[PDB]
Every structure is written in C-alpha cells, then in structure tokens.
Design a protein around this ligand. Sequence first.
Ligand code: NDP
Ligand code: NDP
Ligand code: NDP
Ligand code: HEM
Ligand code: HEM
Ligand code: HEM
Ligand code: CL
Ligand code: CL
Lengths: 514, 514, 515
Amino acid sequence: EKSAADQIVDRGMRPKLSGNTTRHNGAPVPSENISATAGPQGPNVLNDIHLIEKLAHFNRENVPERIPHAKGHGAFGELHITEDVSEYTKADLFQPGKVTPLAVRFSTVAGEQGSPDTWRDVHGFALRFYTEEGNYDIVGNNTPTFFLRDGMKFPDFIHSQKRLNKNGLRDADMQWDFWTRAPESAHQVTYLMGDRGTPKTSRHQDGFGSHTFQWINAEGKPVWVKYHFKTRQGWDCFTDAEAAKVAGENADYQREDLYNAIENGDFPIWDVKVQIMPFEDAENYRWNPFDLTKTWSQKDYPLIPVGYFILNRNPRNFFAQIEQIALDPGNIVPGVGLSPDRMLQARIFAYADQQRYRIGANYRDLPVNRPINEVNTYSREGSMQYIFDAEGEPSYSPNRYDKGAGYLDNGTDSSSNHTSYGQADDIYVNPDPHGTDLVRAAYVKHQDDDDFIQPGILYREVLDEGEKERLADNISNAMQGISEATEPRVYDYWNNVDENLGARVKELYLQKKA
Amino acid sequence: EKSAADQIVDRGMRPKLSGNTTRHNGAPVPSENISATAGPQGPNVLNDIHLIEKLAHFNRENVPERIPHAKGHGAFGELHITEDVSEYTKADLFQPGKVTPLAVRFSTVAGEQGSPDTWRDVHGFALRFYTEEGNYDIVGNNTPTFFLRDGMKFPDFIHSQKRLNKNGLRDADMQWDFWTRAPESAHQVTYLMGDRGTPKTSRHQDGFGSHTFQWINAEGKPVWVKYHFKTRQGWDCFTDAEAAKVAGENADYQREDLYNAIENGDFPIWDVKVQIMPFEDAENYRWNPFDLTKTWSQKDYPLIPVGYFILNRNPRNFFAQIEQIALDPGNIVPGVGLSPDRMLQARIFAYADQQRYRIGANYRDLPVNRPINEVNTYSREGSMQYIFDAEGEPSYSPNRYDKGAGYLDNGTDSSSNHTSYGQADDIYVNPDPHGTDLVRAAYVKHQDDDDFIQPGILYREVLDEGEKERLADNISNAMQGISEATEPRVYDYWNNVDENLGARVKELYLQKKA
Amino acid sequence: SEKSAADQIVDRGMRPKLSGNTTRHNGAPVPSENISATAGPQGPNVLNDIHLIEKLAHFNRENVPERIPHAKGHGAFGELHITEDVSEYTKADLFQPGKVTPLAVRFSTVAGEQGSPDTWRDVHGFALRFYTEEGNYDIVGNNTPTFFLRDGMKFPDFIHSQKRLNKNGLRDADMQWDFWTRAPESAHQVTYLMGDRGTPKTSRHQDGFGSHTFQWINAEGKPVWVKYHFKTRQGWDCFTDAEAAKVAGENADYQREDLYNAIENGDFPIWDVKVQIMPFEDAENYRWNPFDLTKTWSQKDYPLIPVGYFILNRNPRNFFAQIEQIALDPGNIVPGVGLSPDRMLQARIFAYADQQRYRIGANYRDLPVNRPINEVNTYSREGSMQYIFDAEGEPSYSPNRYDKGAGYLDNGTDSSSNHTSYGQADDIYVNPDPHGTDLVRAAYVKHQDDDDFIQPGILYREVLDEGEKERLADNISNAMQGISEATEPRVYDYWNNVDENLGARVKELYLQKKA
Ligand SMILES: NC(=O)C1=CN([C@@H]2O[C@H](COP(=O)(O)OP(=O)(O)OC[C@H]3O[C@@H](n4cnc5c(N)ncnc54)[C@H](OP(=O)(O)O)[C@@H]3O)[C@@H](O)[C@H]2O)C=CC1
Ligand SMILES: NC(=O)C1=CN([C@@H]2O[C@H](COP(=O)(O)OP(=O)(O)OC[C@H]3O[C@@H](n4cnc5c(N)ncnc54)[C@H](OP(=O)(O)O)[C@@H]3O)[C@@H](O)[C@H]2O)C=CC1
Ligand SMILES: NC(=O)C1=CN([C@@H]2O[C@H](COP(=O)(O)OP(=O)(O)OC[C@H]3O[C@@H](n4cnc5c(N)ncnc54)[C@H](OP(=O)(O)O)[C@@H]3O)[C@@H](O)[C@H]2O)C=CC1
Ligand code: HEM
Ligand code: HEM
Ligand code: HEM
Ligand SMILES: [Cl-]
Ligand SMILES: [Cl-]
C-alpha cells in the first residue's frame, strides 16, 4: 500500500454491487438456482435466456496458457531511483528521483497451469515499469544465464522439458538426451541442479535480465549493461526432497506466499543494480559478452546500484491482471537498446506473436497492458476493439491532417527522394558485425569461450562442500529414469563441467539405480 | 496385438520419416541449430523463414483446456456384448454378439492441466463407442450420483471448486460456503469425502452414467436405465495422506499407470451392467427417479449384465487423440434417449457448445471425433474445413437433387400444409410433465425425497466403522481454512447427514485447528 | 472432363456422394430438417432438439475473416509444363527440362471486401502455387510488373487509404489521392493502374508478373537475378472505365464466373512462362536500382527468355475449402530460388504466413489445398485443430538420439556448438554488397536514373499510343471526383511530374467534369 500502482490496478474494476443479479444486457435475473421447464417434470425450454448465457460464458472462461511459463502469479509495486545513472542512460524511469509504478509476474517454466510451484525449474522474474515514455518490460529469470545461445533451438529445449508426444508424460531420458546433445546448456543446467533449482518462495530469490542490453545516454553514447535484482529477503532454498513434499502439500505454495506477504504488509524488496561494460571493451572481454550462456564476472564488472523496487499491491483480479498481462522484452523505451544476443533477438519477435494469439489482436488495450500515456497509432479494428481514435482521424500516414508520423519523419511525405536517417540506435548501436553477408555462423570466439568453463568455475571456486554434494545428489536424482543409451553421455557431460563432480554424479547415480 | 480400435487410432498418422527436416511447405530445412544473421555478430535477419515458422507455430501449440475436467488421459479398446438385452433396446452396439471400437478419457474435475491426478476429486469416466449408427458417448463419472439437480447451479459449483477471483487460490471457505448453502450436494460430498475420493488409478474404480437414461426397443417401448461399469481390477484407494504424498512425487500417477498397464499387456476390463426401471414404475418409486442426487437402490433394481469392455490400445498421439477428443453426452444414437433430469438436459447443450470454442467449429472432423459411417450434413464452411461434400452437392433442403433430408421428411418439400410427425422419442418418450405452463418449479416430490437421507443411508447402513472414521478424518482435513462464520454451517451440514458423523467431524476438526 | 495433374490435389478431402437421409455430426440419423421439437404443438421449443442447435451453431460459424487485402477472388488448378532448358541458371526441380508440375492459382482484386465487384478499377492479384517434388513453390504475383511502394513500413498506410474511412465506413477519393501524392514513389504503379490495364475484362486476358526481383541459383551455387513474366496467350483485353463500372453493377462476379465457365467449356487459359535474367555482376551498374520494386527492368536491356507455359484445366471441387482457404505465400520458396534486397519482398516473407495463422488457424498448412505432395518432416506439433500427427513416439526435439533428423547443414546428432559455422545463407539469397555495416534507416542505393517519375513518364512518352494516353487522362480525372480543394493542386503537381502534357490534360478534363 498504497500505492503508485493504484492508477493501474483500479482500471476496469466495477464498483461493489448488491441486490440481485442481472443478465449481461442488464435485465434482472429471476433465479440463479432453478432453470425453466415445460411443467415441473417437463423438458428444459430453449429460451431460459439466463441459463444459456450463464452456461455459454462459463464454457468460454479458459484461454490458451502461456508456452512456456504457464504457472505463475504476481503483484504490483513501485520502482524507486536512489542513484544518478544519467551519464549512462537517458531512459526516463531511471533518471534521478523517479518513482515508477510496476507490475511483476513470477513463474515456473515447464509445467502447465495447475502444476506445483516447487517442481525443480527455472523461475521467471518478469517486470513491467509503467514509464512516462511507455511500458518498459524487463522479462527476466532467477538466473543470470540460460540454456542456449540461439533462438532456433528454443522450441527444441522447451519440447524436451514438456511431455512426450505419445503419452503426455514428462521424461528424464528426453531431458538429458537434449541437454547432452546441446552442451551449451551446461552452465544453466549446473545452476538449475544446485540449491537454486528449488527456491522456497518468489521473494527469496534474485532476478536478472540475463541478456546483455544497451543503455544510451542523452548524447547518444552507448554502454552495455546487465540487470541484477538482488533480494533483500535473501536466497532461501528447499532441498530436492523438501520441494517435492511441498509440491504435494501445496501446489500453489509460492503463489500463496506472495499474496500472504503483501496482505500482511511484509512487502518484499529487491535492489536494482547493473553491470556496466564500456562499449569498446566488448571485443576484448575474455568471454563473448553477447553469448547468453556466458555471465560477466562481477570481479570484472561489479554491481552498480540504481535504486530498488518494492511489491506493495496484490492484484484486484488474478485472471484479468496476471493471466492477461502481456510481458514482452520488446517493450523497450528511449534510453534502452538491444544487443547481438541471438536469443534476445528471437524473443523480441516471439512474445507479442504469442500474445496476439493467446489473448487476441487487441491485447494491448486491456487495462494491465496499456501504458500511462495515450497511444498514438494507425493500427485499427481487429477483434474486440474497445478503444478507438478520435472521430474522423486519419487511418494512414503521411496525411494532410494532424495525427502525425514518426519522429524522424516530417509528417507530410513518405521520405522519398533518397532520404536517409542513419543509425537505428533505438534498436541498438551495433558493434562490428564481423562480416558483410547473410550467414549461419558461430558467435565471435573469445579467449575463454567454451560450453563448460563457467559451470566449472562455479563448482570449483564458488560452491561450498555442502552445495557441491547436494548438486551431485540432485543431478543423480534427476537422472533416474534415463535409458542405458543415455547414461554414458550424461557421465561425460558432467565430467566436462568438472571431473570430481562427474565422478560423484556417476557414483551416486549407480548407488541409487538398481 | 491388434485392436478393433486400430482403424480409428491410425487416422491422421504420418509414416515414419528420416533424413532431414522440411519447412511446412515441404522445402528442406538448412538448420535446426543456428539462425541466420547479417554477419556472425550482426542482427538476426527477418527472412530466416524457418526460424519464424518454428517460433510462430511453437507459440500456438496451446489451446484452451476443458472446464471442468482439464487434467485427464485415455485409451482405446473394445466393447463386447455377452448378453441379450434386445428386449429393452434396439441400439445397434448393444445387440447380441456386437463388438464395437471405443475410446475412453479419465480425468479429475477441478484442477488445471498439470495439476496432480491424485488430488481428492471426482474422477471422470467418459466413453465413446464408434457404433455403426454413429458415435455413442456415455460421459460418466466414478460416482453413481452428483452434487446438484439443476444445471443453473453448475457454474456456481465449479467456480467454488476452482480459484478465488482475487488471488488465484483454491479455498476451503469458498468450497464449504457453497456446499452448505446448496445442501443437495450432501449425497455426493459424502461419497467424495470417503475412501473413493482418492482412487489409486483409473483402472481401480467403477464408472457410472449417473443420470437416468432411456432405452427404446424395436417396438418403440421405453424403459428407464442407469449404466454401471464394474471394475474387474476392483476399487483400490489411497488414504488422504497417501494421495497427497503421491501428488508431490508423481502428479501424473494415474496417467502413467494406465499407459504402462496397457503397454505391459495388463488390459483393464469393466463389466457393463444396467439397472432397468419399467416406465410405469417411475411415478411410484420412493425417490424421484430423475433426480441426479438420488441413486436407485440396487435392492430395488439389481444390476443386469450386458457385456464388458477392455482397454487394449494406447493413443498414438496424446494431444491429437486425447486432448482433442470431444466427448459429449448429446452423442446419442437410435435406441437410446434422455430423461427429465435437468442436469442431463443442460449437459446436452453444454459440451458441444464448449467444443466449438475450445477446439473449433469443425471439431467433429478431426480423426478421433469422426464416426465410422459417412456424415451426410448440410453444414458447411467454418474455420479449418478439412472435409467437404462431393462436388456440386446442394447446400439446402428441400432440394431437387438426391442428397436427402430427415428420415421423417419426404426429401422434396418443407413439410408445410400442417404436416405433423408426433412424439419425439429419439429425444425421449416423456413421462407426465405435471403441468402445462412454463415454470420454475421443484422436482415432483416422491415419498422419501430430501437432501440428506441417501448419504445418511450410506453412512449408517453401508460403510464399515473404519470407513466412517476415515470419512470424518477426511472431512475434517478438508475443513482446514474455513472461516468462523462457516464453521457452524459445516457442523449442521454433517449433523444432517448423521449426528454421529457430525460430532466426530467437529471433534477431529477442533483437534486439528491451531 | 478427362484429367489434370492437379486431380491428386483437388480430390483431397472430398466426401463420396451421399443419399438417403441426413445424419448429425456424430453420424446418427436426423429426424427432420423441417420441424423443430416443442413441448406440445403450441408449447415452447425444447432445449434438447440436438440437431436444431447443432445446425444453427455450425451455421453461426461459417464465416471466417476475409483476406486483407485481396478479399475478393477466385481460382483454378492446372499444370506447369517446361519446354526450354534453363538448368544453367537454376537447379529448382520444377524448372528442369520436361517437368510437369500441378498448380493452383487465385486471382483477385485488392481493396474491396468479399461481396465487392471483380471489375472495380484495381490491381489484380495473380497468385500461383506449384506443387513441386521439393515443396510448394508459390509465386504470389500481380497483373503489374511493378507496385506502389518500396518499403513494407508503408504498406498498411497504402491499404488503409484504399479502404474505408474510420468514421463512416465509406471509401474516399480524397484519402486515396492524399496518400498517393504524399507518397510519390507510387507514381509508376498509379500510372499503370489508371490506364487501360486497371480494368482488364477477365482473369484470362491479363499478364501476370512476380514483380519483385528474385534470385535463381544453379547446381554449382551460382546466382543470377530474375523477374518472372507470365504472358497471356489470350491477350490483354480491357474495359473502358465506363464499361467496367457498368459490369461492376450487372455482375459483381463477372471474372469469377468467366473463369469457371471457360474451364467448364474446355477453353483452358494458357500463359507462357518467361524470365528476365540479370547477371549478378550487372546489378550495381544498372541505370536503375534493380531491387526497387517501383523500378522495372527494361526489356530492351533484359529481354524475356522463355521457360515454358502453364494451363488452367481444373475448376475447384469446393470454392470455400480450396480457394478461400488456400494460403498463398511468397515465403514458399524452394531450392534453386532465392529472395533479394527488395524491402517490400522481405516484409511480405513475414506477413502472409502471419495473417494465415490468424485468418485460417495455426494448422492451416495441413488443409488439403495447402499440403505439398511430399511428406512434411517437422518438429512443430499440437495447436488448434491438429488433424495430422507424426508416427507414434517420434521425438519432439532435435538434436535427438533417434532417426527423425535435423537440417541438411546439421549433423543430426548435436546442436552445432564448438563454434560451428555453415557460411553464406544462399537458400535465402546470395547477397550483394550491403553498402554499410550498421543497422540503419536509409534510402536505397541511388542509381543514375533513379527517381519517382521517370519510368511512368517513359511509359507515357514512349510506350502508350495516343488513345491510351487520352483514356489515361480521362480515367485519372474520373478517379479524382470527390477530392478536396486542398488535394487538387497536389494531384495536378503529381501528374505534371510524370509528364507535363499528361498533367495538363488531366487538369483540363477534371475541371470539365467538376463543372
Ligand atoms: N557473474 C554473474 O552475473 C553471476 C555468476 N554466477 C555464477 O558464479 C560463477 C562466478 O561468477 P563471478 O561473478 O565471476 O564470481 P563471484 O564470486 O563474484 O560471484 C559468485 C556468484 O555465485 C552466486 N552463488 C553462490 N552460491 C550459488 C549456488 N549455490 N548456485 C548458483 N549460484 C551461487 C553468488 O551469490 P551470493 O553472492 O549471494 O553468494 C554470486 O552472485 C559463474 O561461473 C556463474 O556460473 C552466479 C550468479 C551471478
Ligand atoms: N445404488 C447405487 O447405484 C449405488 C449406491 N451407493 C451408495 O450406497 C447407498 C445404498 O444404495 P443401495 O444400492 O440401496 O445399497 P447396496 O448395499 O445394494 O449398495 C451399496 C453400494 O455402496 C457401495 N460402497 C461400499 N463402500 C462404499 C464407500 N466407501 N463409498 C461409496 N460407496 C461404497 C457398494 O459397493 P461394493 O459392492 O463394492 O461394496 C454398493 O455399490 C446409497 O445411499 C448410495 O449412497 C454407492 C454406489 C452405487
Ligand atoms: N519492363 C517491364 O517488365 C514492363 C514495363 N512496362 C512499362 O513499360 C515501360 C517501358 O519499359 P520497357 O521494357 O523499357 O519498354 P518495352 O517497349 O520493351 O515494353 C513496354 C511494355 O509496356 C507494355 N504496355 C503496353 N501498353 C501498356 C499499357 N496500356 N499499360 C501498361 N503497360 C503497357 C508493353 O506490353 P506489350 O508488348 O504487350 O504491348 C510492354 O511490355 C516501363 O516504364 C513500364 O512502365 C509494362 C509492362 C512490363
Ligand atoms: C529465444 C529464446 C526465448 C524465446 C523464443 C522465448 C519465448 C517466450 C514466449 C513466447 C513466452 C510467452 C509470453 C506470453 O505468451 O505472454 C515466454 C515466457 C516467458 N519467458 Fe521466454 N523465451 C525465450 C527465452 C527466455 C529467456 C532468456 C528469459 C529470461 C532472461 C525468458 C523469460 C521468460 C519469462 C519470465 C516468461 C513469462 C513472462 C510472464 O510471467 O508472463 N525467456 N517466453
Ligand atoms: C449440468 C451439469 C453439467 C454441465 C453443464 C457440464 C458441462 C461440462 C462441459 C462443458 C465439459 C467440457 C466438455 C469439453 O469441452 O469437451 C465437461 C466435462 C466433463 N463432464 Fe460435465 N457437466 C455437467 C455435469 C456432469 C455430470 C453429471 C457428469 C457425469 C455423469 C459429468 C462428466 C463429465 C466428464 C467425464 C467430463 C470430461 C470428459 C472428457 O474426459 O473429455 N459432468 N462437463
Ligand atoms: C510489403 C508489401 C506487402 C505486404 C506486407 C503484403 C501482404 C499481404 C497479405 C498479408 C496478404 C493476405 C494473404 C493471406 O491472408 O492469404 C496479401 C495478399 C496478396 N498479396 Fe500482398 N502484400 C504486399 C505487397 C504485394 C505485392 C508487391 C504483390 C505482388 C507482387 C502482392 C500480391 C498479393 C496477392 C496476389 C494476394 C492474394 C493472394 C491470394 O490470392 O490468396 N502483395 N498480401
Ligand atoms: Cl465460439
Ligand atoms: Cl494469431
């Protein structure tokens, strides 16, 4: 409470009503209890209008769930800026003193809508900031990295984490068959199989933008950034056995936790920080700075504070404001840009594409998805158009009226006669493409770029002995059910991360198997 | 290793393919691994055609799940008739020696896709018989009764069993607030709260049609019937604690069990039996024979054997044949009719209505939904029309061609000139309607009709002391979370079933409270 | 009437002829198609007349979103026959010597909706599918060698300006000309459109063109740039503005009916397939930007080279199922064919399948008319109305330990990590110099004679005969009726910039008719 988000979360909400019910045309309902028949023991009549309306709308309550990240929950709150980063970005929401309303949705990845919150899985950490220059979404995860570096492979990964086509069962052999044949997965798989694969709540986990993004300042100068959201509640994790116990006791443990916390005034807080890499330092970093499977060392690029955000408002209506929210990494704003991360670039297409289907063509007009400023667009019509332009405004640009065109355009013509605008920094200021042809090529290879060195460093230099052993324990548990064919491939995969981890994984797996 | 269902389940299946993949136009795919960029570090190009197609179709994999009964699984098999019931029904599939292909889907009711199979719940038990006179579906449950006697109340019950609007949580206070204020629920709630609320598998439970239906013989003579599907595997139930434990360990426990049992050759079997009430017996029965909340005593109307069915074929593709199956109690055939059960009459509208939305206008044309005989219909067009009529056939009747009209019609005119056909026995031969006006009325009151006698009979005359105790223990567990306002309502509700059950419920409830 | 190579395709999905009585969609017999069930003869209609509700509910769902644009159209099926040897230029299977390939075609107008006249003045779509052994190859062309714009960003602006005002649902001359004069790149196509060819009499009496520059690649990987021309053996034959408007009223489906009748009568329409072929190394030196859709290649510089012909010899069996639901897409390319740096073309490669996913459904590729003759081997799955599914238990992901496979550049067993590179994506196109290394918003590379007006001026001054030149001015001044006073001088200047004599005659005729 009480709360900069109130202007957003109150949108679309009816006043409280009493007395009797009405049909959807507003006329009084005679009964919610008894349907009309032709004689007490006679047949139901076709023209019990309320009955049919009630049943027919009930029949249409469900919509396609997200793929992936179907199971989730969220809240609203406030972003507060506490440091001055104007030398790096001109983005309005990050300027000194700014307070911006936010929405957040937390989620798992693989499971469907009814599935337990505490299955071992990556957790989504997706933020919307309702800024004065548009909705800026940072659609992140509770991990600084991810399983892949090319969006072409994303549907393969997600099918491998979901259900077999023949019987609708999730499958260990399929999961490890994919992971070990796509060894770029090694970094994120090591993270996933550790303690953090099973955080207790949504409040007790960090969030990350994961990808490298770009910040552009008022002079048009760019820097590369990575977002970190550090939990003030601290990381707190279940064991593998505890996470499964909780799954059976309360499939909605984390959903209920976050709701309860906010209701109790126990508002969770994250500190907003960035790693900042100078534009010209990208090519010489020991790892490729645009490879999603590579984190930037915090020794090389320490966390730099920006502000914090707080979750202080539960949704008014879960379906309307959480299920229907359309969080999209393509929702960037002036002062923020993308990068040559191929995963990120695929995502920039993919989210709005699914949302057009899952919600509908006009999903942007729903209360939770509208920005605080008016949208000035030539888009029109489409299913369920609630909002429409002022009477008689033009439908095309360039036109002879006032509605306007792009800020690069003159508003009066098509920019013919060989007009050029130059570098598209609003997308991003690009580094060298390293070629002039359309190609299918590897990422530029940096000195320490391979699939295994980073999880190896995590194991050897970061984890304590308890974490190392639990990791081997979790892995060997997650291997139960794989085929004889897959066993040696998995042994080798873990040996590539680290030989001691590999040995312990194999030892524990064989102990546990019959 | 063959099944009568082989003809059905092979419909729509591709041959095994190898080599390289193709785009959906059939052109070869260059890579499933790397996307095309403008330079190795350049931006992703818009025209990686395969990339966009792969992502866009991935984005559209999900469809609305069923409401209710979202979480389910199934198989295919054979119905075998071993008795002669031709005196009672002319239905082709029920004639002596008939062997009919079948499909079945089992499910829970309240939870979404991915919710655990072993949540306490009713379990769906929905059969399709691919008969020579059309698909006959018996969309039943693992209970002989149900929670309500009027379809007007059905969406209220289902919302109460799903999630609160504000926070997406299922809620004990909500569930009990509804049940106690709709005391007609008492019979089914007593059944649900016992051992049978947690069957171990889909094989270890009976199925029932629940509703009274009608059978009509070759002479047009009607009798009232109830369907019973008696498991040869026998009832086998988890305790409340065991069912929760399984939910956390394997959310798909029953799905996996049925698949494995069939794959292993352990084909589950049910004996098909009916209760048969003479048409003239209906008005005289001690209970209203059309009240879904009332079972017919098996001492008054014993089970009469018809035959058995066996499940001997797993689906080829789970989504295509199970998620997309459209089971519908309105799928009746000659020899079978409905009844003045208002729940049944609402369902006859409701299923196809949801299926037109959930699947699409042309859902009937999907492989699993087509009958074995050709469909002769004047319906046309609609989204995704795969199947169309012979070239140039007429789109309207009556017409000057050969396509035809209804079997009561002459095929050449509109049946004007005050043509009449008489009683619609294909719907059902109706009993006395007990009035001539459109009304909202009670069911005709029979001698022993109330909301509490039958679950009371179950408790006092059927359950053993161990069943009675676990019942109270289950109920008192399910009460955890109710408000103080709701507490005495729940006490009264159980006292009304049996005062000893009620007192034991309260005792355990207070012990556990906190 | 005997047969077509396309018979395999058009018979897919068709029921046998049925008689006797109707059935519900579960297959059970229908009692009546004439009388519904009531509780007593004068009593209320009962809910459980199952057939009544099913019949009404399916009726209620017959309509689907029409195409935007090109809503009004019709088509046929036929055969492509190769009669020359172009193997030196392309390896595309359907273009090899002696090949006979089944085809579909859809013709259309552009702006009007489904009920609108075939003979409103408009571009006509000329959209072909070839069901080749290496996939469906679609050439989604028009009856003009050029088009109104050179950047896809402007396409929705053009199409809204050709459709209806938001306030009142009326089409509007002022809006059309306000857009065209503010987007002068449109001058070439507007000149073509406002001439005789804006009103061809039938679908049979017009040429077709691919319009865009595409690429051909041969068996050795060498590319050439190409433009497709489909030259009508029936000959161009056009209405005057007045005749076309009269026919629009007399028979809104004049062209749909003509094509159906012609094929039923055995008068199978034929087009000769030809290409212009520009050597890859010629591109930078051509007097016009060879990738700018608003620029044609002179046939004096690049003469038509013959490839073969195609013939339409089969009417659809069912119009909705096979024509309304056809999903023609320029992104349906096959080996031996590539794209080009034409920005309109590149936008289209995204746009069509996107609209088809919506207007038909996620699984539109599986409908009979959209399936290729070869089996599709894909990891795509599920989605609404999935009819076809993979063999039992096949994997849903690659790389996998099974045999389903992966891309032809992949090894089928791993993810191509360890810094694997495949090189130039020639299956998209062998690209020319990009002329920059940054993401930019820039003009096309400017060639010697590139502007918005020289080509229609050439058409007017060097190609059109005196009657065509006069009918052009007359047609233009008719289409101008309704423009605002503010719009008048813009249109005067526009036509002046094409040709000062044309502009003078347009203004003269316009003022005479005003008013
Ligand atoms: N650089 C980054 O953006 C991050 C990297 N990592 C992993 O740590 C390795 C070292 O990175 P670097 O920043 O150079 O070294 P640092 O020592 O500076 O950082 C180590 C990071 O690992 C986190 N961590 C601690 N325990 C676990 C665990 N059980 N599972 C997963 N993460 C844990 C730490 O969180 P805390 O400080 O609270 O203990 C800290 O953020 C990398 O290889 C990467 O795999 C992990 C998080 C962020
Ligand atoms: N009449 C019916 O179609 C059914 C009735 N019932 C319940 O039994 C009561 C008496 O019916 P009536 O047929 O006259 O008496 P019966 O004694 O003839 O039948 C009692 C029925 O209850 C079943 N039953 C046994 N234990 C349980 C339990 N733990 N939970 C639910 N059902 C159980 C029996 O199955 P079994 O033979 O395996 O012991 C049997 O089918 C009714 O009030 C009703 O609640 C239950 C199922 C069917
Ligand atoms: N180059 C091309 O791909 C085409 C160009 N044009 C137009 O012709 C101009 C000259 O091109 P170029 O190839 O150098 O000259 P060419 O003399 O070699 O060909 C001129 C083309 O214009 C066609 N034409 C004739 N009358 C009309 C008319 N009423 N409306 C539209 N087109 C007509 C001709 O068709 P026909 O031989 O049957 O008389 C011929 O194809 C261009 O500026 C362009 O506007 C038109 C069609 C194709
Ligand atoms: C190329 C790789 C990826 C693609 C194509 C992709 C695509 C998608 C799509 C289409 C959705 C559903 C969106 C919706 O329907 O509203 C989704 C959900 C989501 N994705 Fe990804 N994703 C990718 C990788 C990632 C990465 C790397 C992250 C984090 C850094 C991420 C985080 C999320 C989150 C948090 C959600 C749920 C958002 C919400 O809570 O509503 N994804 N993804
Ligand atoms: C008026 C009361 C009821 C109404 C309006 C109703 C409506 C529905 C609807 C609309 C569906 C989804 C169907 C689909 O989308 O394919 C459904 C599912 C189902 N219902 Fe009911 N229902 C009612 C009561 C009952 C009763 C009394 C039974 C058992 C006798 C039952 C058994 C089932 C089963 C088994 C399913 C899932 C079928 C499957 O596995 O696909 N329902 N119900
Ligand atoms: C950037 C420019 C353009 C875009 C974005 C575009 C987009 C579209 C779209 C989305 C459709 C609907 C397709 C469907 O729903 O099946 C369509 C129809 C069509 N377009 Fe375009 N178009 C463009 C320019 C052109 C050009 C230059 C041509 C010809 C060379 C063309 C020829 C056609 C034809 C013939 C149809 C109808 C196809 C049929 O008969 O089904 N369009 N266009
Ligand atoms: Cl609908
Ligand atoms: Cl869509």
